[PDB]
RNA sequence: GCGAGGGGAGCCCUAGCACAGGUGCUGCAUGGCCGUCGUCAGCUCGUGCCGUGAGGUGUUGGGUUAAGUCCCGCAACGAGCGCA
């Protein structure tokens, strides 16, 4: 039961601050705000979830990234509640593209994890 | 070797020979050691990112220190010669 739970308080967002390539997903500009098409979210939802379903059961990994302040914390809840990785404070340059190197910092962390206890 | 002592074994001489010797020149052929900017807060590298490219970013910015000293930020994340 997704559906009207979306209308819940989760439809529409910003205004005249838009990217016009996002025009297809918009239902209207009621009250000078861009109300995003409720139901197209649903059509995008299943397709997405289906990719996650597949990815999940294949034992793969999602990386959760929310550094904007309202998401900061609700990201680290759900990611831990999924045993998945998350990036929370700052996205660093090349966490992915220079992974090997940024990894060496994980490597260092648990050398110091190893000198507290 | 001879029972009557001649054969360049050390050693020492003179006569030749290979050589020694040169604080003669070139610090603009050099090593090394030194002076010097300056004990000044700097100079870089790896990988990533940006640029057709030289290169850039990091090392800019805000605060702070004697200090590229530390801090906060940040397409950078770290490191090395320095600083201490
Ligand atoms: Mg950062
Ligand atoms: Mg000279
Ligand atoms: Mg010299
Ligand atoms: Mg001279
Ligand atoms: Mg290129
Ligand atoms: Mg330092
Ligand atoms: Mg300074
Ligand atoms: Mg010192």
From Swiss-Prot:
One of its GO terms (biological process) is translation. GO terms for molecular function: rRNA binding; structural constituent of ribosome. The chain holds residues 7 to 123 of 256 of the full protein. GO terms for cellular component: cytosolic small ribosomal subunit. Belongs to the universal ribosomal protein uS2 family. The keyword DNA-binding does not apply. This is Small ribosomal subunit protein uS2. It comes from Thermus thermophilus (strain ATCC 27634 / DSM 579 / HB8). Spans the head-body hinge region of the 30S subunit. Is loosely associated with the 30S subunit. Part of the 30S ribosomal subunit. Contacts protein S8 and may contact the N-terminus of Era. The gene is rpsB. Keywords: Coiled coil, Ribonucleoprotein, Ribosomal protein, RNA-binding, rRNA-binding. The keyword Iron does not apply.
